[PDB]
């Protein structure tokens, strides 16, 4: 297919989104990812090469992609994500910080021949258009809400002994799954301590806390997305887009652009400008795969 992409800072004082698109034409294989970093860019930077390499490795070990073992593909991509996060946390600890507290979300799409898989953590979103109809392919990992993932995430966080205030875990983080974010994982106890030292809560408060598991995890949801000849285009984007434009609206908008000039790169740039005209307040990154059709 053809790719259109854009990644802009918009109204934020820093740019922490990034995008990756890598193809192997001989193998009919492509990897597209949007990363939405927070509290710095070091996690995003790490993921840029490390996640690709690990995913490619996890799936090549066994020529795994089109074997039809969904379970095995799913397990491979999960272990890839978990492994990368393990390595990131070490890196953040040794090649850092000392005040680097960064993290990043990630929505990855892998296509090989006529199969597509999505590995997703966080609050970017992927959608496609199929015979004129929208399919929303991912669900949000937020510690509040009503979608399938939402109730389960809040349950998982509370189960780990964390709490949620102002729609944030420990009043801090607004996503429940992410790479990095060591203070919610292997340094959560230290986190409580720092809070006392910085006067965000009392000593007796920390006493009543009992962390059982990690509050934030990098374990992805994994989806298999059937590809058919009537899939018109696929869109991966950060929440800088979706928070300000409903997916049914973006799909109609892109369809209109492509009917107009058939240029996916121009469609993508014009879409990002619509998001800015609507005064989205975040970095905005968009990747569109134009598969053509009718």
């Amino acid at each position: 297919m053809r790719w259109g992409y854009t990644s802009v800072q918009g109204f934020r004082d820093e740019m922490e989104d990034d995008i990756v698109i890598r193809s192997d034409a001989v193998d009919s294989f492509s990897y597209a990812a949007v990363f939405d970093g927070h509290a710095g860019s070091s996690s995003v930077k790490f993921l840029r090469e490390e996640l690709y390499k690990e995913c490619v490795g996890a799936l090549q070990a066994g020529s795994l992609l089109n074997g039809g073992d969904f379970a095995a593909i799913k397990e491979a991509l999960i272990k890839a994500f978990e492994s990368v996060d393990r390595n990131l946390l070490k890196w953040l600890e040794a090649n850092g910080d000392e005040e680097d507290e960064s993290g990043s979300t990630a929505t990855v799409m892998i296509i090989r021949n006529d199969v597509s898989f999505i590995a997703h953590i966080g609050e970017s979103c992927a959608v496609l258009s199929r015979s004129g109809q929208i399919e929303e392919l991912t669900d949000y990992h937020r510690p509040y809400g009503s979608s399938r993932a939402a109730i389960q995430e809040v349950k998982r966080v509370k189960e780990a002994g964390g709490w949620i205030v102002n729609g944030r875990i420990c009043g801090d983080i607004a996503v429940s799954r992410a790479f990095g974010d060591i203070r919610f994982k292997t340094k959560k106890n230290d986190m409580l301590k720092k809070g006392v030292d910085e006067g965000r809560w009392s000593e007796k408060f920390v006493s009543r806390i009992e962390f059982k598991g990690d509050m934030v995890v990098a374990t992805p949801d994994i989806f298999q997305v059937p590809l058919t000849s009537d899939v018109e285009f696929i869109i991966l984007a950060s929440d800088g887009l979706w928070d300000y434009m409903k997916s049914s609206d973006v799909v109609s908008y892109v369809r209109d652009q492509l009917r107009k000039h058939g240029n996916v790169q121009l469609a993508c740039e014009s879409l990002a400008q619509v998001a800015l005209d609507r005064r989205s307040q975040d970095n905005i990154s968009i990747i569109i795969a134009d598969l053509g059709r009718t």
């Binding site: 507290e101 205030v165 944030r168 420990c170 009043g171 801090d172 607004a174 986190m191 910085e198 809560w201």
Partner: peptide, 10 residues
């Protein structure tokens, strides 16, 4: 919204 914030108890 800013994705992180200084933490707060319930």
């Amino acid at each position: 919204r800013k994705t992180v914030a200084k933490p707060k108890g319930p």
